[PDB]
Design a protein around this ligand. Structure first.
Ligand code: CL
Ligand code: CL
Ligand code: CL
Ligand code: CL
Ligand code: CL
Ligand code: CL
Ligand code: CL
Ligand code: CL
Ligand code: CL
Ligand code: CL
Ligand code: CL
Ligand code: MN
Length: 129
């Protein structure tokens, strides 16, 4: 029930305006997706999912997803995050940030620009695969 690689979603309405600088205070590598403003909705009668970011988070040692959730809530506020997911395939999850994983492309998801990925704490995907 512990892991090193995690992902979670952040939504503009429920994060502080200085959320990115606050993540920059943590001591773990992260990759932040481009803004996902054009993802297809799962809600009957809507077109777009609520604009959000995806964060790929690399713990230093094996930890629980709950521990990561509590850490981000203490940093960004209780309303900032509902849950944290474990990542088992870190390369595919990195590519998912721009919907360029094989599964994202199979599902015809909206492709984003890799230039809009933000790396914190010298994230380098080659180290984690
Ligand atoms: Cl930290
Ligand atoms: Cl962006
Ligand atoms: Cl850690
Ligand atoms: Cl951690
Ligand atoms: Cl833990
Ligand atoms: Cl995964
Ligand atoms: Cl997918
Ligand atoms: Cl999509
Ligand atoms: Cl596209
Ligand atoms: Cl890249
Ligand atoms: Cl750095
Ligand atoms: Mn998305």
């Amino acid at each position: 029930e512990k892991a090193r690689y995690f992902t979670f979603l952040l939504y503009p309405e429920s994060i502080p305006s200085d959320w990115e600088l606050k993540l920059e205070t943590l001591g773990v590598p992260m990759a932040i997706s481009p803004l996902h403003d054009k993802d297809k909705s799962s809600i009957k009668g809507q077109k777009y999912k609520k604009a959000h970011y995806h964060v790929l988070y690399i713990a230093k040692n094996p930890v629980t997803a709950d521990s990561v959730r509590k850490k981000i809530k203490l940093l960004l506020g209780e309303k900032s995050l509902a849950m944290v997911q474990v990542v088992l395939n870190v390369e595919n999850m990195y590519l998912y940030l721009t919907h360029e994983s094989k599964d994202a492309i199979a599902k015809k998801k909206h492709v984003y620009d890799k230039a809009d990925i933000k790396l914190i704490n010298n994230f380098d995907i080659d180290r984690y695969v």
